[PDB]
Design a protein around this ligand. Structure first.
Ligand SMILES: Nc1ncnc2c1ncn2[C@@H]1O[C@H](COP(=O)(O)OP(=O)(O)O)[C@@H](O)[C@H]1O
Ligand SMILES: Nc1ncnc2c1ncn2[C@@H]1O[C@H](COP(=O)(O)OP(=O)(O)O)[C@@H](O)[C@H]1O
Lengths: 579, 578
């Protein structure tokens, strides 16, 4: 955990790399520029984000990248709260020694991993053992004497657990949020992990993997690549898994194929799925004909509410690159006026999706959350509120809304609003509404709620009246005839397939070599048309759930006779079922 | 430790004067302590919010008291840095510390983060911490009658220090470092932006001090550092791409207004890191809508709180009032006049009520931003039930207690209509009983903002005992002139040229490497039609509805930011307002 990593290993965090250069490498090479204004370079950064986003990798790359020249950067790394012992002496004494030896080797980086355990928040009881550590840490990090060129880096899952006196200029003046990688950063991470391989993958395959890995972190992508490689080893040379002696194998023709990555995709569960909220994922390919017609409309509406496709201001992905490629150009009437009139476009982002019971709302919500890739999703659903048994409903709601306030582009998500307004206490809705009306108009905190058979009277003169769902109510109407036709057309395409097409795996004729130790398908188109007509007629004024039920029931019948070439039996069974 | 002089610290002149007294006059004018059988003050305890100048004050005291004609030595021990696993070796270290601080006649001692070194009295934990606090008590209580050991103590929470160490004998004077106000932030920014090659205009520094509410000294320093760093990035970006030193020269790196305005959006003050934000002035866009009725709301607050006069301690430092003012029959006269000066506050109450969504969140924030010297205690829902352990009762009582400690305080209750429903009856009655057990002269202001609050609730209801009799301010919907100004500001974007819009353009030529050592058509008739339709459509509208119309029309206007034939945009604006 010391070396052999650099900044080309890191993918999708190019904005923070520039600032870390600006605080570590740049002062060393150019001390005249910093001393020109009599400023001290910022020292100490608090990395926080979802686990497996690259904080420790970022710190190691900082330590090993700025030391490429003949200016060594010693890297003192401390695990979370591993310094306190059973007595009262060593806890502060060892921190003292750490900072003194950091002073000795003047260009140095102390990395407190999991700093939330070393410096907890001051609770009601058990004060001494952690207060005596926090006080001395505060004393050495911003003492009277010049600490020197010691860059203090802390890493945490959440920053609220660190003492606020640490989150102060001179100690932790910069706080870096490491976000879950988007599609481009995931593409770059996949390219990086599959860079040293002997048989590189194609670019389009990496793009498709990046699309398929929505919700993954960097760590999840690395685990996926490792699992794909392990499956490739298992597929090429299974014999090494049986013998206890080292057989002779060749690191060749062990190229990874798509089938191995697909299997690793089911073997790996992301950190998105471990969470209790709704995992943002695109519309599954089966239901896409049914819903995508009315999902695009929502996107268009969202496009007119959050100004997603109209991004001329607040396009800050990387300030340094902006200064590199773009070019500047009285003062107030050219910056303040236009900035204000650009942020004046978001008034009060709200959206309530309300459809009949079972009309694929769990699907539309996930698709919308996937479209808003750059937004910070906060789930106010019942499961997330009640999952932390120590917290209360009100406390969880306040925590979620306050988290959504920072990281301004964010979405407060309330799936199953009809259940939510019936199982939550009446005062929590009032607290949330007071929080939302205590917001500025130009704030991009979208309130997206999905409800099943919600009465409009409850929104007009009920408890949800003070959320301002006036024009922002979208009705998810039942799917039309053409979408049902496309759904069952895919079903029929499954029906009229030859058994030589349906993938049956194998039965190998010859055993694996030992290693040296060291008919025609009969289906008239008339029957296909009759089955299509019966499916269309049976599902009249049906929702998405009923259509899925009919699809599953018919797919069972079709897959039953997946080898029979005379498909009249499956056809008459299908017709009999729809009666 | 640098050569920081006292002219580096800004906004704490009184404490600088007191420290100069207690450091020099005991040793420069010794006879004045004989006629009065009184000892010089021995202990001083600095306390306040983080990043205010405690360590700066100690470092300035060290640097100033080191010169040719007199020597003063500084001894620093950091918080709990003196203890070890050995049982009584910490006692030996502290005792020998005081021995060298006594053997050297000239030496003053400083304990940074004293609350960690000396916590409160130990009910449990009879371990070495209690022995350390007892030895500190018994060792700094006295070993020299009228000596030269000054024990300074820096801390963030003064209440975490052992009460036996806060005494007329040990830690005599307790100094409170406040978050700087506008005048002090001006001086701090001048001190930071002093040695720059191209100083800033004083109006810009005033505007900066206006915007940086809640910023400490450290926050302003960080803001200056970030502005300089952004200037360095903007001037010489190529230094961020090379791994070896290039040749860049100063005197072309100038810190402009844009860099400061871009650094403010990324710096969050230490008073808002765990809170999210701080109360901001009235936003520029809606200023034509509410500033007409906000100024009145300021004047009332300037009448029931005596803000503009501040007849007690209005100048910089007390020694300065003794220097440049002359003092004045003082036994009864002074008591009478102090009584009459304090009798100008009866019961500061204010209930700002208006229709739904009439910009109350803006008015409350602007008012809380106006009251600079006031310790705001928020009693909203998000602050009471934020914790899952303390009850609403305990939170409300504790918040009122903290408001009572720091006497100029504003108990702030936004969304009173939701508040009188979410908060049960017992908590409202407890808060009322707390408010009726105060003196009339107490400077605790109960500020309340509500939407569509029936006055039946406030003269005969739950709030009837809070004495909101004649202090109910009515926010009415903005008049036609305010709407006209708002939409004229909106329309001025329609009249701007496509080449005038700050649309950043790609540079036609790459960055230079360094040595490796047409008039748009808009007839005024369309502008008049747009103004008339905008005015007519937003009749008797509230602030939220006006903002909705403004956003909806700004979207259409910003769609045609490059077009010159603005007839289509005007037609779309007319069509939407129908
Ligand atoms: N942005 C990224 N770019 C490249 N690799 C990443 C990124 N984020 C995570 N990784 C990979 O994930 C692995 C583990 O990351 P880790 O340091 O455990 O993150 P965290 O400390 O947040 O859990 C690293 O070895 C790294 O290769
Ligand atoms: N009153 C002040 N005037 C000028 N600078 C200040 C002031 N207070 C704090 N600072 C700045 O804060 C930094 C040190 O603050 P510090 O002493 O650490 O505050 P505290 O010890 O109260 O947290 C210095 O860089 C200094 O520039």
């Amino acid at each position: 955990v010391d070396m052999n990593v650099n900044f080309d290993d890191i993918g999708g965090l190019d904005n923070y790399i520039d600032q870390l250069k600006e605080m570590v490498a740049l002062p060393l090479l150019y001390p005249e520029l910093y001393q020109n204004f009599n400023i001290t370079p910022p020292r100490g950064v608090l990395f926080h984000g979802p686990p497996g986003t690259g904080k420790t990798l970022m710190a190691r790359a900082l330590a090993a990248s700025c030391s490429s020249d003949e200016r060594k950067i010693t890297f003192f790394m401390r695990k979370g709260a591993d310094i306190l012992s059973k007595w009262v002496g060593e806890a502060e004494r060892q921190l003292r020694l750490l900072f003194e030896e950091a002073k000795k080797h003047q260009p140095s980086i102390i990395f407190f991993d999991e700093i939330d355990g070393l410096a907890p928040v001051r609770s009601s009881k058990q004060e001494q053992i952690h207060a005596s550590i926090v006080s001395t840490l505060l004393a050495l990090m911003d003492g009277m004497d010049n600490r020197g060129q010691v860059i203090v880096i802390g890493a945490t899952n959440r920053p609220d657990a660190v003492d606020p006196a640490l989150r102060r200029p001179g100690r932790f003046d910069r706080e870096f949020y490491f976000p879950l990688p988007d599609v481009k950063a995931r593409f770059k991470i996949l390219q990086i992990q599959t860079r040293k391989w002997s048989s590189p993958l194609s670019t389009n395959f990496i793009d498709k993997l990046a699309f398929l890995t929505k919700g993954y972190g960097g760590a999840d992508l690395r685990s996926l690549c490792t699992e794909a490689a392990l499956i490739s080893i298992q597929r090429s040379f299974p014999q090494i898994y049986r013998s206890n002696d080292k057989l002779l194998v060749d690191p060749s023709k062990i190229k990874v194929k798509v089938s191995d990555f697909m299997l690793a995709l089911k073997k790996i569960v992301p950190s998105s799925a471990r969470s209790t909220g709704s995992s943002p994922q695109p519309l599954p390919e089966l239901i896409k004909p049914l819903l995508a017609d009315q999902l695009n409309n929502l996107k268009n509406k969202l496009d007119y509410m959050l100004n997603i496709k109209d991004t001329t201001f607040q396009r800050n992905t990387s300030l340094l690159q902006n200064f590199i490629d773009y070019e500047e150009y009285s003062s107030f009437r050219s910056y303040e006026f236009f900035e204000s009139m650009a942020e004046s476009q978001i008034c009060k982002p709200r959206l309530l999706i309300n459809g009949p019971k079972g009309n694929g709302q769990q699907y539309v919500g996930a698709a919308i959350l996937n479209y808003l890739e750059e937004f910070n999703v906060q789930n106010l659903d019942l499961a997330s509120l009640v999952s932390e048994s120590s917290r209360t409903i009100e406390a969880a709601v306040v925590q979620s809304f306050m988290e959504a306030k920072k990281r301004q582009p964010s979405v407060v998500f309330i799936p199953n609003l009809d259940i939510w307004i019936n199982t939550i206490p009446e005062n929590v809705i009032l607290v949330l509404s007071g929080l939302f009306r205590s917001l500025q108009s130009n704030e991009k905190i979208l309130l997206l709620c999905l409800a099943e058979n919600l009465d409009i009277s409850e929104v007009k003169n009920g408890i949800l009246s003070d959320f301002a769902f006036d024009k922002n109510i979208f009705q998810l109407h039942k799917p039309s005839k053409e979408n049902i036709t496309r759904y069952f057309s895919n079903l029929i395409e499954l029906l009229k397939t030859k058994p030589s097409d349906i993938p049956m795996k194998k039965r190998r004729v010859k055993p694996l070599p030992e290693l040296q130790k060291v008919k025609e398908l009969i289906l008239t188109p008339e029957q296909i048309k009759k089955v299509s007509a019966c499916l269309i007629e049976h599902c009249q004024n049906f929702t998405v759930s009923q259509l899925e039920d009919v699809h599953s029931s018919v797919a069972k019948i079709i897959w039953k006779s997946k080898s029979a070439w005379d498909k009249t039996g499956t056809v008459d069974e299908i017709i009999k079922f729809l009666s």
